[PDB]
Amino acid sequence: MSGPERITLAMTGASGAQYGLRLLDCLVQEEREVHFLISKAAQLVMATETDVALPAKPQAMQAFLTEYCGAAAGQIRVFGQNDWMAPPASGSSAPNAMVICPCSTGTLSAVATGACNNLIERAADVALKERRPLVLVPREAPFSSIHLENMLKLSNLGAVILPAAPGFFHQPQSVEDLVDFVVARILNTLGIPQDMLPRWGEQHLVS
Amino acid sequence: MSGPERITLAMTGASGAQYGLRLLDCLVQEEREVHFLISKAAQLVMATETDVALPAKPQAMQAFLTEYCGAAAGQIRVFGQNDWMAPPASGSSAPNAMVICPCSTGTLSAVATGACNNLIERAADVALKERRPLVLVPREAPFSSIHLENMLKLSNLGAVILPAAPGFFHQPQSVEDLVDFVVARILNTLGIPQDMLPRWGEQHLVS
Amino acid sequence: MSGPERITLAMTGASGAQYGLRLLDCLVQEEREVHFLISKAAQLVMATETDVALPAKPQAMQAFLTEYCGAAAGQIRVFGQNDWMAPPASGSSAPNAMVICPCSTGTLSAVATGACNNLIERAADVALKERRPLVLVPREAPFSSIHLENMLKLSNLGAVILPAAPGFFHQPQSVEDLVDFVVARILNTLGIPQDMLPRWGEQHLVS
Amino acid sequence: MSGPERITLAMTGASGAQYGLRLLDCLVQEEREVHFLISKAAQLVMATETDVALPAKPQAMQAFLTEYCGAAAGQIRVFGQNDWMAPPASGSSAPNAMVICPCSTGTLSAVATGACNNLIERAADVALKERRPLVLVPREAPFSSIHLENMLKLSNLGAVILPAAPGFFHQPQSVEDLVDFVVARILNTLGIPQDMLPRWGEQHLVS
Amino acid sequence: MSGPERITLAMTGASGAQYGLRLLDCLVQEEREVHFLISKAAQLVMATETDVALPAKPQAMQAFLTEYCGAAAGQIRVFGQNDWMAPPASGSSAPNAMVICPCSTGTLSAVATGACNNLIERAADVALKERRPLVLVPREAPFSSIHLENMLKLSNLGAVILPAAPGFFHQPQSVEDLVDFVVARILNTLGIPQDMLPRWGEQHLVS
Amino acid sequence: MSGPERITLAMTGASGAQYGLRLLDCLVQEEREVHFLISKAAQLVMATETDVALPAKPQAMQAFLTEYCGAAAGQIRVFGQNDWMAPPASGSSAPNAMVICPCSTGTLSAVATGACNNLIERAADVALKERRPLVLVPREAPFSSIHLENMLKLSNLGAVILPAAPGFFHQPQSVEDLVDFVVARILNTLGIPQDMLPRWGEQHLVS
Amino acid sequence: MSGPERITLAMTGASGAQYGLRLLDCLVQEEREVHFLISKAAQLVMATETDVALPAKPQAMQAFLTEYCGAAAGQIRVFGQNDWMAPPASGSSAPNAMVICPCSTGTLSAVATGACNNLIERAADVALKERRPLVLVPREAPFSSIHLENMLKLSNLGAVILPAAPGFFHQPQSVEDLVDFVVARILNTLGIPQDMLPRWGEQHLVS
Amino acid sequence: MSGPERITLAMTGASGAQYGLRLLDCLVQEEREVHFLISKAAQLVMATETDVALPAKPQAMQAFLTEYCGAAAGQIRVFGQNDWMAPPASGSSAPNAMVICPCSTGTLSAVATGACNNLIERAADVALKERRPLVLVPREAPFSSIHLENMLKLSNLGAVILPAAPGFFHQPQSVEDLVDFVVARILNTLGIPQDMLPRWGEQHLVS
Numbered sequence A, B, C, D, E, F, G, H: 001m002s003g004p005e006r007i008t009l010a011m012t013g014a015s016g017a018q019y020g021l022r023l024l025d026c027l028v029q030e031e032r033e034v035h036f037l038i039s040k041a042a043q044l045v046m047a048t049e050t051d052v053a054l055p056a057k058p059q060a061m062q063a064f065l066t067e068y069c070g071a072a073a074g075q076i077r078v079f080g081q082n083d084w085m086a087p088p089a090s091g092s093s094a095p096n097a098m099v100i101c102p103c104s105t106g107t108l109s110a111v112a113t114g115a116c117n118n119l120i121e122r123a124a125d126v127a128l129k130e131r132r133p134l135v136l137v138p139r140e141a142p143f144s145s146i147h148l149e150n151m152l153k154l155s156n157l158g159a160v161i162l163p164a165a166p167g168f169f170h171q172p173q174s175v176e177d178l179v180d181f182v183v184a185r186i187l188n189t190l191g192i193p194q195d196m197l198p199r200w201g202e203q204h205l206v207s
């Protein structure tokens, strides 16, 4: 298998819940183990932007997402926001890649400053210290200098700042096509196969 | 009238030609004068991503866009990439707001470093020196530290970095809705009326 | 009318509750719409430093402040600390000026780092990204280098750092005179008329 | 009326007394109130470079300049270098735009470092703290790194650094034409009408 | 005795002459030796804000302050602004703590840049080089980035930046109470006993 | 002979073609060898601002300038913008001093960032690496922070930033006098004799 | 002759008047022209540390120093602290090397920040902009970070920071030997012959 | 007793062996315990500049210095350059103040960069980490930017940079007087009594 066996997928409270749900679906279909984290604010975004009725508590949420995605038993773990006994909280855990999608400006701030106030922020702190993959998918416009400084600091360390800024070069025909563009870029970053976005120029040879 | 009477609208070679065309259409409908600039690479993006058959040379291009947008004679000026006799090239011109939409990473670089190699880059240099509005709409993912440093430098000076990162909080149903989200944010930044994106919470009063 | 029609007034937990209440009163008397936010810690400061019996929950609080200030129905909105549906949470809202008065060192930190952990901090983040007025009124002494760096970062972006440091050059005779000095400076910053602090030297002509 | 009703015009001891006198004349003709300040060194520059016989003390100086410019009684205030009772010394004064023309390297230094050693330097410090317009017109060549760092710091804060570097693109025929070029740029910066320098390209439409 | 036997107390030309006079009175009552310095501008502030008729020259001033404060002969030294033979001018003097109260923005600048243009600024330069206490009490609002950078530089070196920003948490009933708050904080910084501001929470034990 | 035997004189597209032509004339009269470079944009400035009919191609241009200046055969070399076989392109060439007069903001940018996109920019890069004289004569107003940072970087390395900011202290009577002021300063920087601007104070002895 | 024909020698108010007088004597004996400047504070240092009875005003001072040093008529110019008509005030003057010996911490500050408040500070500003030699001889201990930052900034530009820190490696037997050590180093820096300090190791050949 | 009971005195290879020997003598006379360290290069400086015949190895050296200074048995410890079992090598040792006198540029570098290559450099590293006094007495001229950056870094941390730059304000009559000036300043920094340099201005009272 190419790419990580396990991904920590954190959803935080930026607009674009569709991106995180699509990414979750794609990771499940690629037979990956997902350690799923979601902030309080992200639950309110999901309720506002989608007709996904996500249960609030981790055990109900795990059962719901397992069904929603057609996952295997055990494939989606869900951990609460203060569950320090979960793998992502320690660098002595088995290695995971981590994606924060969507990434609110507040979570971006916390990761850049090392705040570690909940399991998402601690998980990202652990990824950075252990040199494990960390991809942040912010959705905001305009970006202020506060945002940009935080992104720059993290990019300089080795985090991938991948804004939810879909391209139009494969003639998207629906909202789903644009969502799939960004999810494809995340999967490409992680080194996980995807067939939503072709390999640009693969067949080109000269000119 | 609220907002600027004249806007310099530059299209450069990032994916998202739809954004610049929609913005042009909205500015024309708000009875604004538009000084329209387009890079060579942007012409190739437009041909690839749209079925707009934009003529190559400025006089033909002006006539085409005037018809396309239903503009008045004289309302859309078009200037070539080396036309230093055009208003945007000097700070002694009448004041315009300037928008680069889409903004390629190369144009972002040129603006940040002061390269002034064509009329778009000179126009932005003039906006910055004269303290006139400058809005940059980059479309790229991931953003590297090179991109982020360039954006941060310009944001710190007072340019608005407004990534083509549409929100989903008004339940978009088409690609056009997502395009209209970003265009609405640009128009809000410029202080020009728009009725595509409601005023969040305007009717909320308590809780 | 000169100055903003709407002001977001946030009270946080620094000593000087009197300043925020006086400012609220003056804004109401100038027929402005106020979007009123208050932190948990600020409620404890108000109870300690004043004999204002402010109710805890937003609907009761709105009714109380409306009476206290002699405001019109609808003139003072009150929003809770997690109410993301309120206007200040999105830059797509109608434009407001924002004042944090008093501004605790912790709120100053959150604004400088982009933490966005409650509606006050998100509101300030939105003001900065949208280039809308932001005035911070810290009350602390000494100021440490941590405080000063945070203030400097925000001042460099364009926020107004206006310490609760009243002047004595108009011969204050009471605590109220000193409070009114700082409130007058805030109103002057916002461009809202005030007749508490004369225009220095207005009548001077030579020497 | 477009632009500020009141301008603080400070003349300091760089070569180019002609620029400050021309600017004063233009501001008077646009019916603006001018708060006029002049350094000791600037008085020696004026005596060396012009045949203007400027009296030394503020009351005589005010009467002289009023006649010289054809100003109304009261239109030109003159204030001495230690007159802290004058409006420019306090941010509680009515708002003025401020221009230092010419701006010596020593005054540029004082403004950049916050020295406030006389009314000119205090006035500029007040402009910066209150976010009121500040335009500096240095005349020096070469510029050393000391000069450039001081200019950069102030430009980054929002001051306009407008060197006395006239352009030749409207075919100047006399020294007066070159002086009028720089004065026109200052007036354009302030948003005050001027008919000395046309609006570049205003009549251009295509090519 | 706790705290320094000798204090250099410099008054400069910020609003808040009351603070410096109160501090002087408290230091005298604690049987400390005070080396008293005052700027020209501070003499004009004192005349404007108080009904203290301070004589201009050092010998008359010393006699006046000795009476005003009920000091012992010799307890208050007064030194002129160019008296380099006074103790504060050399680091080979006996150690003193130094307080600049109030501290103008111009004196803050001079101390931060090392200007040493009069005995106050030299005295502060000496305190910094000898690692002796230096407390600066600025009174300004807003603080610009120039002010903040100067404060930050000095705080980073070890100076105490203590703005004249009184707290309200001990229910002040008069202007004097607010003055006494700031003076108490200065005395606490210096390690000199004071009974104006209680020790917060001293009697609290749990909760 | 005092000063360099050979000067690389580059004209770029800032306003002030008169300065470069005057400098060329003076260098020829001082019997110096000039390696003459001119940008495309500078040719359009010269055509706009002067009645010099400069041929476009290097061989015609060399013959024209030789006649215009009364130069010796071989004294003025002219090299095209991509002629990497010309001496200025390599640091193994015989040493020349280099002057860019006028220096556009775009050429200033290219030199500061090391862009080397044509022979002028490469020539300046070579001067900096070889520690050979480099004088830049910018003509712009206002200068933005982008401009100022670029100038500061180059000044810190050892380039001379000499803005086209003529002085008035020798009572100029014509445009030519002002042009001659700046050209004299350039020649003084290079250490080449000039008799247009006297040696200030040379005859002064005391007071 | 090796080394500069003319030296601007400025004495400022640091301890070590002996160094400046010795240097003056050596420059006169090497048949150099000296443009002599002295601060008010330096006159008080000279009176305190030496039995040189230096007259206060420039014409008397010039006559006195001419006799004291055995100089030729005209060899020592003396200029007052506000004499802007003296050569050192303009970069269009004939080139001089400049030495500030001793250099007070306040003059070091002024030079580093570009204050130009008197002819000494302006002269140094001119040296830096024109790339002419500038040697600063500070005498202070300890050096604070303020001092060190100012020295570092100037050293980075190309000024020579030469502390009055004599060496003992040629077995000094008197105060005069130690003074002569520092003066020899200054003369070596300037490239002026001196026979007080031998060339270290000149005769050594191997080991 | 005022001041530290124990001082680590390190002599390194700058010119000025006299300073370290005098300081050693004064510390012994004040009944302090001295932990004495000396570099190889310092032994060669001492042999070159003095007629002190210092034995090479630590036990002989200790006996020699004990006699030379009239110290008590045990009062002067001497430790070798690799003796990690000596107290200064660990922060768990009893607290000492540390002085490096003279301080070579190489030892200054090592301390600034944390090199810890011998016991002197380790001892200084320990002083900095434990927040114990560290005084560096460099002797070099000119100081390069390398030197100055190293000094600035250490001063910013809290080390005292005290150059061997004696003052002349107490009319020194011999080399010994100048040596005693610097040693007095060191002792004052350490808080150890000295009667070589009076307390400036102690008896002054007014003017």
Ligand SMILES: CC(C)=CCN1c2cc(C)c(C)cc2N(C[C@H](O)[C@H](O)[C@H](O)COP(=O)(O)O)c2[nH]c(=O)[nH]c(=O)c21
Binding pocket: A011, A012, A013, A014, A015, A016, A039, A040, A041, A042, A044, A045, A048, A103, A104, A105, A106, A107, A139, A140, B167, B169, B200, C084, C085, C089, C090, C116, C117, C118, C122
């Ligand atoms: C339309 C509004 C109010 C904003 C657009 N969007 C968003 C949509 C919706 C519908 C809600 C409710 C909230 C947001 N927010 C704000 C955000 O959740 C908060 O700052 C919050 O503190 C984040 O906390 P976490 O980092 O998740 O712990 C948020 N934050 C952000 O960074 N980007 C966004 O797109 C948006």
Ligand SMILES: CC(C)=CCN1c2cc(C)c(C)cc2N(C[C@H](O)[C@H](O)[C@H](O)COP(=O)(O)O)c2[nH]c(=O)[nH]c(=O)c21
Binding pocket: A167, A169, A200, B011, B012, B013, B014, B015, B016, B039, B040, B041, B042, B044, B045, B048, B103, B104, B105, B106, B107, B139, B140
């Ligand atoms: C699918 C490819 C190859 C990239 C996506 N997209 C894009 C789409 C298409 C279809 C074309 C052709 C080109 C791009 N580029 C590259 C870009 O135009 C160039 O770097 C170019 O030099 C820009 O020059 P200008 O600044 O306009 O003068 C470009 N640049 C960028 O910054 N963002 C983009 O989205 C893309």
Ligand SMILES: CC(C)=CCN1c2cc(C)c(C)cc2N(C[C@H](O)[C@H](O)[C@H](O)COP(=O)(O)O)c2[nH]c(=O)[nH]c(=O)c21
Binding pocket: C011, C012, C013, C014, C015, C016, C039, C040, C041, C042, C044, C045, C048, C103, C104, C105, C106, C107, C139, C140, E167, E169, E200
């Ligand atoms: C006398 C005490 C304990 C401090 C003076 N004052 C204050 C008065 C009172 C009476 C209370 C209770 C609290 C304060 N604080 C502390 C402060 O509220 C907290 O740090 C807190 O976390 C702030 O959270 P928010 O930013 O409001 O969300 C606070 N914080 C601050 O920045 N400035 C202040 O003046 C004071």
Ligand SMILES: CC(C)=CCN1c2cc(C)c(C)cc2N(C[C@H](O)[C@H](O)[C@H](O)COP(=O)(O)O)c2[nH]c(=O)[nH]c(=O)c21
Binding pocket: D011, D012, D013, D014, D015, D016, D039, D040, D041, D042, D044, D045, D048, D103, D104, D105, D106, D107, D139, D140, F167, F169, F200, G084, G085, G089, G090, G116, G117, G118, G122
């Ligand atoms: C030909 C000389 C000596 C210089 C050219 N010019 C000038 C002309 C004349 C004829 C005089 C007399 C003085 C100058 N100066 C120097 C200047 O006034 C001083 O540095 C001075 O301290 C400035 O103090 P202020 O900031 O006004 O309080 C000055 N300063 C500057 O920054 N630019 C200039 O053009 C010149």
Ligand SMILES: CC(C)=CCN1c2cc(C)c(C)cc2N(C[C@H](O)[C@H](O)[C@H](O)COP(=O)(O)O)c2[nH]c(=O)[nH]c(=O)c21
Binding pocket: C167, C169, C200, D084, D085, D089, D090, D116, D117, D118, D122, E011, E012, E013, E014, E015, E016, E039, E040, E041, E042, E044, E045, E048, E103, E104, E105, E106, E107, E139, E140
């Ligand atoms: C109401 C005015 C004009 C200002 C409020 N206040 C003040 C009050 C009064 C009544 C006077 C007269 C002056 C001030 N100033 C200005 C100040 O004294 C000057 O900048 C001055 O150069 C300072 O020099 P020093 O550092 O003392 O040598 C000053 N400066 C400052 O930093 N803070 C202040 O509060 C005020």
Ligand SMILES: CC(C)=CCN1c2cc(C)c(C)cc2N(C[C@H](O)[C@H](O)[C@H](O)COP(=O)(O)O)c2[nH]c(=O)[nH]c(=O)c21
Binding pocket: B084, B085, B089, B090, B116, B117, B118, B122, D167, D169, D200, F011, F012, F013, F014, F015, F016, F039, F040, F041, F042, F044, F045, F048, F103, F104, F105, F106, F107, F139, F140
């Ligand atoms: C009146 C206008 C449009 C501007 C004033 N002036 C100027 C005059 C004329 C009449 C022309 C045509 C052009 C300018 N420019 C713009 C400039 O040439 C361009 O940015 C250009 O890309 C420079 O490229 P190069 O560096 O030479 O390769 C330019 N650039 C600059 O830095 N300073 C100037 O004074 C002006």
Ligand SMILES: CC(C)=CCN1c2cc(C)c(C)cc2N(C[C@H](O)[C@H](O)[C@H](O)COP(=O)(O)O)c2[nH]c(=O)[nH]c(=O)c21
Binding pocket: E084, E085, E089, E090, E116, E117, E118, E122, G011, G012, G013, G014, G015, G016, G039, G040, G041, G042, G044, G045, G048, G103, G104, G105, G106, G107, G139, G140, H167, H169, H200
């Ligand atoms: C024993 C005292 C009070 C200090 C030692 N020495 C000195 C000696 C004597 C005997 C006098 C009188 C003055 C000093 N000073 C202080 C100094 O002159 C002042 O800061 C002053 O403002 C300098 O202004 P300038 O830069 O000359 O315009 C001064 N300044 C300095 O930087 N180094 C010194 O060695 C000393």
Ligand SMILES: CC(C)=CCN1c2cc(C)c(C)cc2N(C[C@H](O)[C@H](O)[C@H](O)COP(=O)(O)O)c2[nH]c(=O)[nH]c(=O)c21
Binding pocket: G167, G169, G200, H011, H012, H013, H014, H015, H016, H039, H040, H041, H042, H044, H045, H048, H103, H104, H105, H106, H107, H139, H140
């Ligand atoms: C006259 C010479 C060659 C220099 C003056 N002086 C000195 C005098 C004598 C007579 C000797 C032999 C050596 C010096 N040095 C050089 C110095 O010892 C070395 O760089 C050396 O590596 C220092 O190593 P440490 O840090 O002690 O381990 C040295 N280093 C320094 O920083 N300042 C000095 O004054 C001098």
Ligand code: NA
Binding pocket: A038, A039, A040, A041, A081, A118
């Ligand atoms: Na949460």
Ligand code: NA
Binding pocket: B038, B039, B040, B041, B081, B118
């Ligand atoms: Na192009």
Ligand code: NA
Binding pocket: C038, C039, C040, C041, C081, C118
């Ligand atoms: Na709260």
Ligand code: NA
Binding pocket: D038, D039, D040, D041, D081, D118
């Ligand atoms: Na003056």
Ligand code: NA
Binding pocket: E038, E039, E040, E041, E081, E118
């Ligand atoms: Na004074």
Ligand code: NA
Binding pocket: F038, F039, F040, F041, F081, F118
């Ligand atoms: Na070209």
Ligand code: NA
Binding pocket: G038, G039, G040, G041, G081, G118
């Ligand atoms: Na002086």
Ligand code: NA
Binding pocket: H038, H039, H040, H041, H081, H118
């Ligand atoms: Na050694």
